[PDB]
Structure 1
């Protein structure tokens, strides 16, 4: 049921998504081990992901959450990187896309920092890097990320020193780095229907000059 619609680079929509990508790159405490060494991306393509069934699944859950949270969906646009990006855009998020060993519990994780999600494109810890070169810092191979609509509802705030159920009375967890003041938040949901993979971004990381 999914169709992908290319956005033109001359479109404000493309430009806004690229700006959110580029402006949320940060340095990581692993010195680039997982995601590579880079300060910016080369954006190759941005596609809108259209699936009526997955969209209706998402809005039905958003409505349930919104009503449970006194008419506040607390909806965000957040990044998600995963080796299962192809499966997600076709079948939606589900328990197979959860990070069982994540710090904030076994759920599906999303990032405000695009570079945080970039660390998971090739798997946990960057896996073995790109298929072709086995390089986690590969500047040649094409990567893909999702920029997703995520319903947080009542979110449990967990400060961090950097499929399960939600904390009782909560629909998500907000993981907020308390040591690195330039690190943005990470968010966890425990139901696949609380996210919709709205944009598919194809890119390369760029070698710093």
Structure 2
């Protein structure tokens, strides 16, 4: 039932992307192959210690959410954790770690920014053959700064613990959530899947 809940979140949050599938491929659903619960006690303690600290700074509320993260470095993340030292100021909300509430938005980043050159075997961003991996993460948002337009920051805004990118006509199509401290996310589930041909 635990993994069925994860499959449901993965499938139901798929959306039609404005780039016509350029970055992540053309699909309406996935073929979910594996769902593995990541058990990293040192990373979990780092996460819960920070979560308690954020809660005390946000009226006894962590404002935790389960969010997706796509990256070519998922295997490094499950072992070493999220690391803001690998984040650079170039992004929409600057040098943060980015998460999506729509799995298909995170799928656009599995092979790199804008989908890179796609899978290493066929160099195809819309590869239906190669197995992809996504993370479904615990993310502590705390006091989240609501923002619509690009704001390149190095750290959370003063008094805040994260940034929420909200959709707008000139801006974002879908929401995104940005943390500036790696310990504010835990890679709880490793999802192995394929995008499926419509």
1:116 paired residue number: 105
Deviation at 1:184, TM superposition (A): 3.7
Deviation at 1:109, TM superposition (A): 0.1
Q: How many residues align?
A: 197
2:79 aligned with 1:79: no
Give the superposed CA RMSD.
2.0
Q: TM-score scaled by structure 1?
A: 0.90
Deviation at 1:179, TM superposition (A): 3.0
2:148 paired residue number: 159
Q: Is the 8 A contact 1:98 1:109 kept in 2?
A: no
Q: TM-score scaled by structure 2?
A: 0.94
1:185 paired residue number: 175
Question: Bigger shift: 91-100 or 115-124?
Answer: 91-100
> Within 2, Cα distance between the matches of 1:202 and 1:116?
16
Q: Deviations over 1:169-195 (max 9, x none)?
A: 110000011239995410000000000
Q: Give structure 2 stretches of 5+ with no counterpart.
A: none
Q: Is the 8 A contact 1:34 1:126 kept in 2?
A: yes
Deviation at 1:29, TM superposition (A): 0.9
- The structure, 1 or 2, with the larger RCO (C-alpha pairs under 8 Å, 6+ apart) is 2
Change (3 A) 1:161 1:91: closer
SS of match in other structure, 1:198: strand
Q: Give structure 1 stretches of 5+ with no counterpart.
A: 1-11
Q: Is the 8 A contact 2:148 2:171 kept in 1?
A: no
Following superposition, which runs of at least 4 residues in structure 1 exceed 6 angstroms of deviation? none
> Within 2, Cα distance between the matches of 1:40 and 1:126?
18
